[PDB]
């Protein structure tokens, strides 16, 4: 949770076999005003997420 | 200044002084009160409780 500079047309690009595009959903390379920053873990083999 | 994450202390002890058998004050994770502690063997807490 930060103060990002979002795009007009955001998308993502997969990492298993990357596509022709470039994952460009923001450009805020200013280590901006991040109010929250966290990392949690989950099972890779579990089918559903909630 | 006055915005962000890297705050200073402002806080109390966090003392490992759990004194059972007597009556104490407590401010545990936000909840305040007075009570008597007593140690016991339990397993129903999970890793987010
Ligand atoms: C949360 O996890 C992500 C991914 O594991 C971390 O992002 C990496 O950060 C390192 C150090 O800055 C970079 O060298 C990597 O390139 C980053 N990976 C990706 C995919 O962006 C992130 O730093 C972690 N956040 C915290 C707070 O630990
Ligand atoms: C993606 O980024 C790389 C490195 O900046 C660049 O060489 C490549 O042309 C970019 N892809 C597209 C479709 O613009
Ligand atoms: C969750 O992770 C454990 C540890 O590897 C694994 O044994 C289990 O199969 C995973 N759950 C599912 C639904 O795959």
From Swiss-Prot, chain A:
Glycosylated residue positions: 22, 39, 43
Disulfide partners: 2-34
Function: Attaches the virion to the cell membrane by interacting with host receptor, initiating the infection.
Descriptive protein name: Spike protein S1
Organism the protein comes from: Human coronavirus HKU1 (isolate N2)
């Amino acid at each position: 949770a930060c103060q990002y500079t979002m795009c007009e047309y955001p998308h993502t690009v997969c990492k298993s076999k990357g596509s022709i595009r470039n994952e460009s959903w923001h450009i805020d390379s200013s280590e901006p005003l991040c109010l929250f920053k966290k990392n949690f873990t989950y099972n890779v083999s579990a089918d559903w997420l909630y | 200044i006055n915005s962000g994450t890297t705050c200073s202390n402002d806080l109390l002890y966090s003392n490992t002084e759990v004194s059972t058998g007597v009556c104490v004050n407590y401010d545990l994770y936000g909840i305040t009160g007075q009570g008597i502690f007593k140690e016991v063997s339990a397993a129903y807490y999970n890793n987010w409780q």
